From Swiss-Prot, chain A:
Family statement: Belongs to the thiolase-like superfamily. FabH family.
Listed name of the protein: 2-heptyl-4(1H)-quinolone synthase subunit PqsB
InterPro entries: Thiolase-like
GO CC entries: cytoplasm
One GO molecular-function entry: acyltransferase activity
GO BP term (any one): secondary metabolite biosynthetic process
Description of how the protein assembles with itself and partners: Forms a tight complex with PqsC.
Keywords of this entry: Cytoplasm
Gene name in the database record: pqsB
Regulation of protein activity: Activity of the complex is inhibited by 2-aminoacetophenone (2-AA).
Top-rank taxon: Bacteria
Keyword Cytoplasm annotated: yes
Role description: Required for the biosynthesis of the quorum-sensing signaling molecules 2-heptyl-4(1H)-quinolone (HHQ) and 2-heptyl-3-hydroxy-4(1H)-quinolone (Pseudomonas quinolone signal or PQS), which are important for biofilm formation and virulence. The PqsC/PqsB complex catalyzes the condensation of 2-aminobenzoylacetate (2-ABA) and octanoyl-CoA to form HHQ. PqsB, together with PqsC, catalyzes the coupling of 2-ABA with the octanoate group, leading to decarboxylation and dehydration, and resulting in closure of the quinoline ring.
From Swiss-Prot, chain B:
Name recorded for this polypeptide: 2-heptyl-4(1H)-quinolone synthase subunit PqsC
Activation and inhibition: Folding of PqsC and binding of octanoate are promoted by PqsB. Binding of the octanoyl group probably increases the binding affinity of the complex for 2-ABA. Activity of the complex is inhibited by 2-aminoacetophenone (2-AA).
Gene for this chain: pqsC
Family: Belongs to the thiolase-like superfamily. FabH family.
Known catalytic reactions: (2-aminobenzoyl)acetate + octanoyl-CoA + H(+) = 2-heptyl-4(1H)-quinolone + CO2 + CoA + H2O
Assigned keywords, A-Z: Acyltransferase, Cytoplasm, Transferase
Biological process annotations from GO: fatty acid biosynthetic process; secondary metabolite biosynthetic process
EC number: 2.3.1.230
Class of enzymatic activity (EC top level): transferase
Cellular compartment(s): Cytoplasm
Pfam families: ACP_syn_III (PF08545), ACP_syn_III_C (PF08541)
Catalytic machinery residues: S129 (acyl-thioester intermediate), H232
């Protein structure tokens, strides 16, 4: 899996939450929709790589937000194809998968199908989800676009979190709102129990997992503000700045490490990077 | 590098069926005899959650039955790919016993722990009525490139709890689930010969034949070389148009929406199972499976012996 170009677009409004799993994260406001940020992020990546929307062979989307995705009151891959004009592109969605796991699966499928220009997008516009006020957990909003060239040689590993190996980390769940009565109500609630050792346990998982691969530079996700400057974190969208910093350093290979709060594991995938 | 064997398949339908004149449709206006002929549905099944039927409980039954019948150790499963058209799931078994209606997580992570698939990579995909074909293709690529030896595929439709029974659309769709096992088959004859997808809400009869045509072209075969066909089940006249569009004769495919309804992503795997269990499809047959999402997909399969359980 070769990363041809990266596009990113985050809301400028940051919202701060207290608690062991809290932090300062980007948050979409009002009636803002995900496509308003996803589209320019994709166009940014296509321009950098000089790839026309008609040249896209495959589009795979990842988005947990249950609404505020497009104007029509729904998965992200298809409405993106419509506005891009990627009429030759195929579309599906990998729901609650991590980015690392999605890149591995897509790299295997796309290389086996002979595709050359694949678009993996990640986005959130979580107005329709109530944050976990007890633990402070919230999703970072924004959009990430990865224009890839599959190769089939990406390696992948799935590793446990750090901390006490006898400790059972309680995963994230998003229960349905059982009392949706009028427009504006949330569709679900974020539920990730307060676990003060979890942010460090995730970072310890990253370090242990990287041992299963050659010694490669990292691009990692940061879902929690604990120990971070100003408590600010961008979740999966942290990868954007790191990927561009790797391009400036003329790096040809990297290890991308994700955190999956649903399985409470860390997942890594090896990648190549274009200059 | 490796050949892909479709080793086994099974389905699980709801215990209770509903006739076209069932009281549940009392509020549906403008129903006619032509309506039933048009869509080809005579009876349909809805999950009864009060009796423990949902998108999860019946998959566990089907998955446990398939693993037991195929003599597959749970720890030997390398990957679990699940699909469910409904954005709402309702049961997590013993893994998350207190969780009810939920948007996330999906099924794969919870299902693998319920079944003891300790080495299986979980994945949850969404491609609407084409989800079964997408999951078989993902599994095929993983097996082809030597990254997996056994892949468990699941499609589970629990849409009846979202139907508006004051609208005629509620008379078309139904609930159901399907589970299939794909394995490495280097020594055997079974393999995936080719697949294709095409693009052009969409009822145009030609878009599926185009995909079928490309798949046959990629495999270097013609319609005459195919023994049997398996289509999605949106309506009898569409399926017929697909068949004629590619040259398939009425004797080379089945219409199965009559007793199940349109089960979105499960109609295809259910139709495949029916043809196998009834003698329509036999070992060595080369078949084509085609359906639509807005996408259209087709796959050319060289089948060996498939375990129906």
């Amino acid at each position: 899996m070769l990363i041809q170009a990266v596009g990113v677009n985050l809301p400028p409004s940051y919202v701060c939450l207290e608690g062991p799993l809290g932090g300062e994260r980007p948050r979409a406001q009002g009636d803002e929709m995900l496509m308003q940020r996803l589209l320019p992020a994709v166009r940014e990546a296509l321009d950098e790589a000089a790839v026309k929307p008609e040249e896209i062979d495959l589009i795979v989307g990842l988005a947990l937000s249950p609404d505020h995705l497009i104007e029509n009151r729904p998965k992200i891959g298809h409405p993106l194809q419509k506005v891009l004009g990627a009429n030759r592109a195929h579309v599906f969605d990998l729901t609650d998968s991590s980015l690392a796991r999605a890149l591995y699966v897509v790299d295997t499928l796309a290389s086996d199908q002979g595709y050359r220009n694949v678009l993996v997008v990640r986005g959130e516009s979580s107005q329709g989800l109530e944050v976990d006020s007890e633990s402070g957990f919230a999703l970072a909003d924004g959009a990430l676009a990865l224009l890839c060239r599959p190769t089939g040689k990406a390696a992948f590993r799935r590793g446990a979190l750090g901390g006490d190996p006898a400790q059972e980390w309680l995963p994230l769940s998003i229960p349905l709102n059982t009392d949706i009565r009028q427009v504006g109500d949330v569709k679900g609630h974020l539920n990730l129990p307060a676990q003060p050792g979890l942010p460090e346990a995730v970072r310890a998982g990253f370090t242990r997992l990287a041992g299963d691969f050659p010694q490669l530079n990292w691009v990692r996700e940061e879902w929690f503000g604990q120990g971070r400057p100003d408590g600010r974190c961008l979740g999966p969208f942290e990868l954007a700045s790191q990927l561009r910093a790797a391009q400036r350093d003329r790096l040809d290979e990297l290890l991308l490490i994700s955190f999956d709060p649903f399985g409470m594991v860390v997942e890594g995938v090896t990648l190549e990077l274009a200059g | 590098m490796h050949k892909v064997k479709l080793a086994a398949i099974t389905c699980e339908l709801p215990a209770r069926s509903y006739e076209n004149d069932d009281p549940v449709f009392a509020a549906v206006p403008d129903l006619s005899e032509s309506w039933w002929q048009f869509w080809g549905v005579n009876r349909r099944g809805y999950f009864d959650p009060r009796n423990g039927e949902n998108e999860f409980s019946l998959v566990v039954r089907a998955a446990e039955r398939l693993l037991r019948s195929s003599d597959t150790a749970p720890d030997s499963v390398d990957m679990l790919i699940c699909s469910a058209s409904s954005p709402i799931m309702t049961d997590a078994g013993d893994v998350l016993p207190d969780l009810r209606g939920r948007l996330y997580p999906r099924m794969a992570n919870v299902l693998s722990k319920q079944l003891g698939l300790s080495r299986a990579l979980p994945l949850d995909s969404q491609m609407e009525s084409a989800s079964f074909l997408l999951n078989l293709r993902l599994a095929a690529s993983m097996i082809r490139q030597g990254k997996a030896e056994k892949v468990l595929v699941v499609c589970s439709e629990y849409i009846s709890n979202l139907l508006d029974f004051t609208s005629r659309t509620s008379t078309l769709f139904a609930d159901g689930c399907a589970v299939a096992l794909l394995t490495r088959g280097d020594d055997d004859s079974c393999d995936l010969l080719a697949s294709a997808e095409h693009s052009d809400a969409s009822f145009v009869p030609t878009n599926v034949p185009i995909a079928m045509r490309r798949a046959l072209e990629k495999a270097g075969l013609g319609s005459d070389d195919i023994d049997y066909f398996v289509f999605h089940q949106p309506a009898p006249f569409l399926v017929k148009a697909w068949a004629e569009g590619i040259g398939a004769r009425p004797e080379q495919y089945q219409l199965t929406m009559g007793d199940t309804g349109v089960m979105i992503s499960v109609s295809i795997p259910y139709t495949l199972m029916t043809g196998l269990r009834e003698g329509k499809i036999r070992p060595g047959d080369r078949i084509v499976m085609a359906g639509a999402a807005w996408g259209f997909a087709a796959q050319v399969w060289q089948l060996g012996e498939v375990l129906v359980c």
